[PDB]
Enzyme design. Sequence first.
Site, PDB file in Angstrom:
ATOM      1  CE1 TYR A  42     -12.874  16.373 -16.805  1.00  0.00           C
ATOM      2  CE2 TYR A  42     -12.254  15.456 -14.681  1.00  0.00           C
ATOM      3  CZ  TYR A  42     -12.780  15.292 -15.956  1.00  0.00           C
ATOM      4  OH  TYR A  42     -13.275  14.061 -16.329  1.00  0.00           O
ATOM      5  CE  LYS A  72      -6.880  13.521 -19.160  1.00  0.00           C
ATOM      6  NZ  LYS A  72      -7.722  12.323 -18.826  1.00  0.00           N
ATOM      7  CG  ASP A 126      -5.975  19.602 -12.930  1.00  0.00           C
ATOM      8  OD1 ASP A 126      -5.105  19.311 -13.770  1.00  0.00           O
ATOM      9  OD2 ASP A 126      -7.000  18.924 -12.764  1.00  0.00           O
ATOM     10  NE  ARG A 184      -3.491  -0.412   2.664  1.00  0.00           N
ATOM     11  CZ  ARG A 184      -3.417  -0.768   3.946  1.00  0.00           C
ATOM     12  NH1 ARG A 184      -3.024   0.116   4.851  1.00  0.00           N
ATOM     13  NH2 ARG A 184      -3.653  -2.020   4.318  1.00  0.00           N
TER      14      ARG A 184
HETATM   15  C1  LIG Z   1      -9.503  -7.531   6.870  1.00  0.00           C
HETATM   16  C2  LIG Z   1      -8.659  -6.545   6.122  1.00  0.00           C
HETATM   17  N1  LIG Z   1      -9.349  -5.547   5.451  1.00  0.00           N
HETATM   18  C3  LIG Z   1      -8.794  -4.554   4.714  1.00  0.00           C
HETATM   19  C4  LIG Z   1      -7.447  -4.525   4.566  1.00  0.00           C
HETATM   20  C5  LIG Z   1      -6.740  -3.510   3.648  1.00  0.00           C
HETATM   21  O1  LIG Z   1      -6.451  -4.074   2.369  1.00  0.00           O
HETATM   22  P1  LIG Z   1      -5.270  -3.426   1.412  1.00  0.00           P
HETATM   23  O2  LIG Z   1      -5.448  -1.962   1.404  1.00  0.00           O
HETATM   24  O3  LIG Z   1      -3.964  -3.784   1.940  1.00  0.00           O
HETATM   25  O4  LIG Z   1      -5.494  -4.110   0.090  1.00  0.00           O
HETATM   26  C6  LIG Z   1      -6.619  -5.535   5.207  1.00  0.00           C
HETATM   27  C7  LIG Z   1      -5.079  -5.625   4.916  1.00  0.00           C
HETATM   28  N2  LIG Z   1      -4.416  -6.100   6.098  1.00  0.00           N
HETATM   29  C8  LIG Z   1      -3.093  -6.202   6.295  1.00  0.00           C
HETATM   30  C9  LIG Z   1      -2.191  -5.334   5.680  1.00  0.00           C
HETATM   31  C10 LIG Z   1      -1.317  -4.579   6.488  1.00  0.00           C
HETATM   32  O5  LIG Z   1      -0.268  -3.862   5.868  1.00  0.00           O
HETATM   33  C11 LIG Z   1       0.532  -3.209   6.880  1.00  0.00           C
HETATM   34  C12 LIG Z   1       0.228  -1.700   6.971  1.00  0.00           C
HETATM   35  N3  LIG Z   1      -1.154  -1.488   7.405  1.00  0.00           N
HETATM   36  C13 LIG Z   1      -2.688  -7.118   7.273  1.00  0.00           C
HETATM   37  O6  LIG Z   1      -1.411  -7.408   7.434  1.00  0.00           O
HETATM   38  O7  LIG Z   1      -3.585  -7.670   8.022  1.00  0.00           O
HETATM   39  C14 LIG Z   1      -7.258  -6.560   6.014  1.00  0.00           C
HETATM   40  O8  LIG Z   1      -6.575  -7.461   6.686  1.00  0.00           O
HETATM   41  C1  LIG Z   2      -7.335  18.886 -16.484  1.00  0.00           C
HETATM   42  C2  LIG Z   2      -7.893  17.548 -16.107  1.00  0.00           C
HETATM   43  N1  LIG Z   2      -7.700  17.162 -14.790  1.00  0.00           N
HETATM   44  C3  LIG Z   2      -8.117  16.000 -14.233  1.00  0.00           C
HETATM   45  C4  LIG Z   2      -8.751  15.091 -15.013  1.00  0.00           C
HETATM   46  C5  LIG Z   2      -9.150  13.696 -14.496  1.00  0.00           C
HETATM   47  O1  LIG Z   2      -8.183  12.709 -14.855  1.00  0.00           O
HETATM   48  P1  LIG Z   2      -8.591  11.109 -14.904  1.00  0.00           P
HETATM   49  O2  LIG Z   2      -9.350  10.799 -13.677  1.00  0.00           O
HETATM   50  O3  LIG Z   2      -9.395  10.847 -16.086  1.00  0.00           O
HETATM   51  O4  LIG Z   2      -7.257  10.423 -15.027  1.00  0.00           O
HETATM   52  C6  LIG Z   2      -8.992  15.377 -16.419  1.00  0.00           C
HETATM   53  C7  LIG Z   2      -9.570  14.279 -17.382  1.00  0.00           C
HETATM   54  N2  LIG Z   2     -10.371  14.924 -18.385  1.00  0.00           N
HETATM   55  C8  LIG Z   2     -11.129  14.329 -19.317  1.00  0.00           C
HETATM   56  C9  LIG Z   2     -11.731  13.091 -19.093  1.00  0.00           C
HETATM   57  C10 LIG Z   2     -13.131  12.986 -19.215  1.00  0.00           C
HETATM   58  O5  LIG Z   2     -13.719  11.700 -19.196  1.00  0.00           O
HETATM   59  C11 LIG Z   2     -15.147  11.822 -19.390  1.00  0.00           C
HETATM   60  C12 LIG Z   2     -15.926  11.649 -18.071  1.00  0.00           C
HETATM   61  N3  LIG Z   2     -15.591  12.729 -17.140  1.00  0.00           N
HETATM   62  C13 LIG Z   2     -11.410  15.092 -20.456  1.00  0.00           C
HETATM   63  O6  LIG Z   2     -12.012  14.549 -21.498  1.00  0.00           O
HETATM   64  O7  LIG Z   2     -11.078  16.342 -20.470  1.00  0.00           O
HETATM   65  C14 LIG Z   2      -8.555  16.650 -16.963  1.00  0.00           C
HETATM   66  O8  LIG Z   2      -8.802  17.014 -18.202  1.00  0.00           O
END
Ligand SMILES: Cc1ncc(COP(=O)(O)O)c(C/N=C(\C=C\OCCN)C(=O)O)c1O
Ligand SMILES: Cc1ncc(COP(=O)(O)O)c(C/N=C(\C=C\OCCN)C(=O)O)c1O
Lengths: 391, 391, 392, 392
Positions: free
Chosen positions: A107, A206, A181, A54
């Site tokens: 945006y 982008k 942005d 993470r």
């Molecule tokens: C029941 C449960 N839910 C949600 C999460 C979060 O999922 P993730 O974001 O990692 O995909 C964890 C991850 N749990 C662990 C991960 C820990 O990492 C250490 C830093 N917190 C663990 O060792 O039990 C979990 O054990």
């Molecule tokens: C300046 C700017 N900032 C942030 C974002 C968001 O980034 P993303 O989450 O997609 O990686 C966009 C994406 N902009 C477009 C995407 C639009 O999709 C259509 C639905 N909203 C566009 O066509 O200008 C952008 O144009």
Amino acid sequence: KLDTQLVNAGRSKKYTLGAVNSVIQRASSLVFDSVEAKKHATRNRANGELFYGRRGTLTHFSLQQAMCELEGGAGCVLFPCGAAAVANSILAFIEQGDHVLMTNTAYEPSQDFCSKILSKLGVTTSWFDPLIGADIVKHLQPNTKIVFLESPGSITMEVHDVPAIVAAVRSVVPDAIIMIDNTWAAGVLFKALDFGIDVSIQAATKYLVGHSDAMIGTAVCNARCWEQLRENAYLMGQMVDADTAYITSRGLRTLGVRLRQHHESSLKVAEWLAEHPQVARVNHPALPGSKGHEFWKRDFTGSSGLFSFVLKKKLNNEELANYLDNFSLFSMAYSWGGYESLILANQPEHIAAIRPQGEIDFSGTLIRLHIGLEDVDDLIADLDAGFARIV
Amino acid sequence: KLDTQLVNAGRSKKYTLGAVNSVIQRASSLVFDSVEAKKHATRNRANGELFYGRRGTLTHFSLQQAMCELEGGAGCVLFPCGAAAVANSILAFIEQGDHVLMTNTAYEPSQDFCSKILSKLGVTTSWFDPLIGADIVKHLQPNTKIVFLESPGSITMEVHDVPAIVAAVRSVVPDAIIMIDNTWAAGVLFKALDFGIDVSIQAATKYLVGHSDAMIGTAVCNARCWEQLRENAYLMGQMVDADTAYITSRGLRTLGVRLRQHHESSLKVAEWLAEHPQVARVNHPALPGSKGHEFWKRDFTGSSGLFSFVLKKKLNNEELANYLDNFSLFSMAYSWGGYESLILANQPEHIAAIRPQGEIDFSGTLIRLHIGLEDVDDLIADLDAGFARIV
Amino acid sequence: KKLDTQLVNAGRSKKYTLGAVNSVIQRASSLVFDSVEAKKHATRNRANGELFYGRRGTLTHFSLQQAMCELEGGAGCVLFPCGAAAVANSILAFIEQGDHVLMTNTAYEPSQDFCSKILSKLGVTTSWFDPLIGADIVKHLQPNTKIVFLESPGSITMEVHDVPAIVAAVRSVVPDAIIMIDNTWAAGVLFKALDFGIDVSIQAATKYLVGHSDAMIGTAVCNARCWEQLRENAYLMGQMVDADTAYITSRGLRTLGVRLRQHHESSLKVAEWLAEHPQVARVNHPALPGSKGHEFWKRDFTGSSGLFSFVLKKKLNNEELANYLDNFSLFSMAYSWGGYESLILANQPEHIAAIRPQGEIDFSGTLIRLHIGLEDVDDLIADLDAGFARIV
Amino acid sequence: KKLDTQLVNAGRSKKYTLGAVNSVIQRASSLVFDSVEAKKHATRNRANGELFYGRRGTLTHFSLQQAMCELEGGAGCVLFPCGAAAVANSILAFIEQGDHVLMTNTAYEPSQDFCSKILSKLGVTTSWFDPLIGADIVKHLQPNTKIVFLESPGSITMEVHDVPAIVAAVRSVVPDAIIMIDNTWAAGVLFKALDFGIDVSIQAATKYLVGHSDAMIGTAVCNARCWEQLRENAYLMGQMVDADTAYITSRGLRTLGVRLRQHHESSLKVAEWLAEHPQVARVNHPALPGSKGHEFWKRDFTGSSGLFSFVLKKKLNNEELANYLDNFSLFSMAYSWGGYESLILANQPEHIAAIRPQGEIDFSGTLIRLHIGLEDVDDLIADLDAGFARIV
Ligand SMILES: Cc1ncc(COP(=O)(O)O)c(C/N=C(\C=C\OCCN)C(=O)O)c1O
Ligand SMILES: Cc1ncc(COP(=O)(O)O)c(C/N=C(\C=C\OCCN)C(=O)O)c1O
Ligand SMILES: Cc1ncc(COP(=O)(O)O)c(C/N=C(\C=C\OCCN)C(=O)O)c1O
Ligand SMILES: Cc1ncc(COP(=O)(O)O)c(C/N=C(\C=C\OCCN)C(=O)O)c1O
């Protein structure tokens, strides 16, 4: 030396292990050889020591280092997409009772996040004109926590006078977090952090990726804001997968040669449209007479390939289909920043709806164009043909 | 028929195009052939029509369909990791002034999100004992918006009496959204949605991926909660990359044979520890005498491979290093749900700190174990050797 | 110690994983040398696991090579783009104009076609033998026989060789022959070829090692005697596999034990059911008694996988074949096997006869080849039973 | 219409992209047939772009094959694991025992070694010629000459062939010869081989098409005359490339124009600077006048890429070589080229002489091969100039 930086950024042997590009380390679990090792990693879990997926793996660290050196920040936080980078960067600093001041050219989804999510959490948002400059002081409140910029603005392309805005803000609300942005400039054509901005956000989706096949968002912060953004984004579980991080570091390598072509072809198309009989106005920052062009000229070191133009007439539903449906080289699609040219139309009513506390100033259909890497003359011939279609 | 479902879920020709697995469609931009096509996609942007990468591509749709059929939901929302699935699922339903009631055995970061982020947004959180049952009514407030469950609980493994909790909640606060972090059961060993739960969340990072090399979170919702979760998570820009989605659908295919081995080996290790002279208590849901084992027995259809046990003594820093540093087959690392066995120690003080409004009931060092796919007898021999090390 | 523990840990040293559970994916053609000294040292060890050039491999390939050697007990492991590439290039690496190749007539068809279409124009001759020839294989050995190619169980028809008899017979006549085996069905672990005196164990890792029908790769684990030559000549032919496929194969190994036990347990129950079925003439499953080579399988293998075939009492015509094959809901029609889904393919006697060189087939009804996946076996049995009803 | 527009759109039909900008990545070995009818139709078109089996390819491979044919103007494109695999298997596909292969003595070394180490044991003979033999190549043609292999510019030394002269000369004597060319330096687009009467244009797509030093692949675009044979014989050898590498190569094409213009513009400025440098004896850059074959390059090509070499006036000893090579900060020591970073490799005259069969080299100082990447050229020039100062 930008070209040299782009080629070399984040490429330490610690990350490449002999290869040219960084290794792809896919992982959730990261193994500790000993209790001592585990203790050490824990203490440095946010300082580039392998700890848990993470937080990131070698692949993420390489990209973070690259982003920090390119944008000159203290740290870089990664997100699933640009939209997540915006929403979460704002959320990391707000508290019930705060006020968010945002440019009305932001945006659309960035605006929606404010009015739909933040509102229910006791945060109010007000909007401001892109060209307000130092008069932004009229919108500042004692509880103004975040000032959100976007230059050029989405769709209509107005460029802010960032220096004037930043001075006015620091003089009234020194503690405000100023965010921008900076996607259109790909973080390199405008060094946000050098102008006093705290956080530079990008939909790396982008120009950094540059191929329309990966989604990621970055937030490069100054030393003052990094820790809070990092730790709070982390509690929201924000991160991006190792492969996308790899693909993003890979896009940086050709960022320079791509941007130069985008700049050159879009400027040429802009000057041609500007002289066309059916075009009312061309909104391209590098083009003289464009809103804020004077600031683009003084503050930026280049242009990318996205811009828009307004037709002399408002197309009806049949004219619109006839025009857009028959292009050969431009594709109708969202997003931009890739190698292929794109086109999208927006009626004046559509824009009027996404300009809060502002007024629209054109009456013809607005066409947004992303100028890709195709031959500029072929693109022009396709546009000319389109005009002939609605003549 | 679970095995048959797992093999077939989400594998429509629309997604596979002749292949066995779904195609990997990497994209931000999605092209519209015509204005009519664009209009159609817009209207169905949230109903599986290709519209924009942030909403998803064919690869995401295939995984969503699979998750919905396996967990029996109306829709499935995807996140970068489990931690993002938790934080954002909660955030999609709260408003300033709401109250969140969460089990005190919740994964630590889920607790931190509540006390660190939600608190500053005018939301209060209180915690409850895992075994409270129908007496949970003593913690319900008129402004209780979300009831957050986690069974088995993190680290200590207590199993809730979900049916009793759900009845008590519906009778007092019918409008509450009841959520459960159903990761340990991989969403299949406990059908959360069949018990009246609104949202079943998973750190798919664990058993669904099953190889410790991808991070993703899922939230399968009932018809009542889907739209709000979907749309609000979308304004926060939550999504997961196409490749990880592919890797997640791929993990489902072997989910059945893996879980059966995990269940069989962990139960065997549990019964062996339970009879060991240096072990004070074994916390395994499938093991008799374990907190809530009676509910695991009545409500679940199986066990996975994560559990913990408490030593008769509290190891000092030297004993801990001597014990943990010399294992041959268990690795010290976070996360679980993979093919390799893992081990982590927790002192009673560490747990006491993450049990809000609750009390710890053991005094010896607690050891959490994830039993992988190695030979169970080899793992037992490694544990036995560890005991001999601290004898 | 035991197989499951070996499958989980094979090739996973810190040098390749760098703190992660799985090996890193190092995608590369160019590999950088820090100095002239480092370049010299890498050149000299370019074939002994030191990073030199992507054609030789990166950390990711070395991790897999090490896992394969460990599992099959070889001295080296050579990687190829697919199983057919492994067979064709392994043979090519050892022959010269004027050599003779002795191959089982139950060899996978493309393996045969390679010998008779490519090898023939290079002055190499090929002859075939019956899988059950045992020690009588001496009657086909020539003075110029360079390679003896085995494939047990055989393709489609599933005959098991009496390998110990064949190896001893060949070694008594041509000690220096290079004996090779396509060990795909056993996934290299259910039959330890190198322990029986075989020189090179070849696998279309595409099947069970990958286990998900989404990657192609070939492996060749060699003894010390044959390693350098196979390695260097396969290298001169530019044979290699991409880093990502190497990663996915290493990854496939981790669940190989649990998957194989399920394929064995399930296919066997289906075989027993089919055996007793009124419309089935015979069942060709190595683990089923009365099957060709069963006692050899029972004696030399340590398990079974999920592929096998059976013969219907009737030879289906065109309409009957379509009505049968087109209406299955759990078995998909497709090539390959070794994955999680159940597959079905049909062959007429004349098709098999056409690919049984210098041999005679022993059936007259339609042959059905089945790959038993990870679905619920009672669901699979139900789908087949509905198929039988469409034929009556 | 123009190259840039072609590079952006080549192979991107909706059939492969399905709404996306780039083609989908379809990872597969097994490809499912809905019915007996669908299986029959796919079998019959298994080599004409219908999904049949992963060894033949999936949508992703077909997209790339179509892009390659379009760019190089061929009738078919065959894919391989790497460039060396493309060269070795393309040659193998057309020869038989008793055939003769005529190859340029400036061919990439492994291409030579294949002929003299593998081909020789199969009864095929190989002789070499000078790159600048032009129409005098008739003196090396034999009645059994089956393949004439060209490589312009040549490896390391960069000589350009007078291809029009060579082709006409060969066609006048052996009309049915199969002329092949390793067209990697021009990336298949700076020199249209098939327009000059060459039969097969081979590329180590590993270089410029991929453009990032992280994937390996070989291509062979053929005219109609040679397509089926190259295709089917390469298939019998199990030659193919993974779907992900095919995707990345298609992806590399999109920026090929902007990258090549930068490699040309930059390498040329470095070449001109080196030419006038006191410590440089000669510069071997096809675009630089006085370079071997310059007028042919000027006449037949439509551009230059970034690889070239130069000769120092001095032949460096061991200490001088290390001091020179070890202290560069912008040029990395590594094999391959064609990516975004600048690379440097040194060769002593005796090393080159050792690989110049039936030829004499024309220099005595240390030869340096440089790949000019996308860095700022003045930064690159500064790094070299510091290197020169370490040699004085
Ligand atoms: C029941 C449960 N839910 C949600 C999460 C979060 O999922 P993730 O974001 O990692 O995909 C964890 C991850 N749990 C662990 C991960 C820990 O990492 C250490 C830093 N917190 C663990 O060792 O039990 C979990 O054990
Ligand atoms: C300046 C700017 N900032 C942030 C974002 C968001 O980034 P993303 O989450 O997609 O990686 C966009 C994406 N902009 C477009 C995407 C639009 O999709 C259509 C639905 N909203 C566009 O066509 O200008 C952008 O144009
Ligand atoms: C025993 C055996 N060896 C080698 C190979 C070749 O491996 P590959 O190149 O595919 O990685 C196969 C593939 N066998 C099949 C696939 C072939 O379909 C294409 C036509 N032959 C099959 O249906 O049994 C096989 O069954
Ligand atoms: C003209 C040319 N053709 C074919 C090949 C082989 O392509 P590959 O198999 O690598 O995809 C190369 C690789 N050339 C180099 C790489 C080789 O390094 C290994 C030792 N030869 C080089 O340094 O020029 C080449 O330069």
